Amino acid sequence: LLDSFAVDHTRMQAPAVRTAKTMNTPHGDAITVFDLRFCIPNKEVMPEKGIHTLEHLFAGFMRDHLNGNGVEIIDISPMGCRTGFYMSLIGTPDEQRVADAWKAAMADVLKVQDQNQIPELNVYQCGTYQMHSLSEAQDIARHILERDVRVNSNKELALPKEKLQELHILEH
């Protein structure tokens, strides 16, 4: 409810961190959602097995690097377009702090030796327990480290009024 942002995916750079939305709780705590954009929109997508395995690993490793000093992660979830994840948290860490934690978590993916070190990979604890690939998760993580992580600007990427009009007044 403070700011959410309509940004232009045709100009979006990746890998990148961007503040997607800021909200406040009734007693005034800040909640921030970050766009952790792994793939360039409409050019690249993550594979379904590797995104799922990465999901099992990512929020744990992000918590290890990012929690504390005014930040408590709520959830990290995949985007339905398979180009990134949204991470919701209590606090207002800056984008570079988030990027650095993200890269450290990617590096942590690469030291996963085998599937027995993937948390919850079994029929009791995973909804689709065959839909997994450590090697694809590690390919994703390696890609992020090879490409580095940029900080994207909501001002730069903002869709102007006119364009949002053109798009929204085709939705009816």
Ligand X SMILES: C[C@@]1(O)OC[C@H](O)C1(O)O
E-assigned strand segments in 95-171: 150-151
Q: Which of 68, 137, 151, 69 is nearest to 105 (CA)?
A: 137
> In whole angstroms, how close is the CB of 158 to Zn ion at the nearest point?
18
Q: Which of 13, 4, 1 is nearest to 157 (CA)?
A: 13
Options 71-79, 90-98, 136-144, 154-162: segment touching ligand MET (CB under 6 A): 71-79
Helix axes 48-66, 95-110, angle to 10 degrees: 120
Which residue in the set 96, 122, 135, 165 belongs to the binding site for its own copies (CB under 8 A)? 122
Which residue in the set 21, 48, 90, 143 belongs to the binding site for ligand X (CB under 6 A)? 48
Question: Is 27 annotated in some ligand binding site?
Answer: no
Residue 18 binding: pick among its own copies, ligand X, Zn ion, none (C-beta 5-8 Å cut-off by kind): none
Check residue 161 for interaction with its own copies (CB under 8 A).
Answer: no
User: If you ran DSSP here, which 8-state letter would residue 115 be given?
Assistant: G
Question: Is 52 annotated in some ligand binding site?
Answer: yes
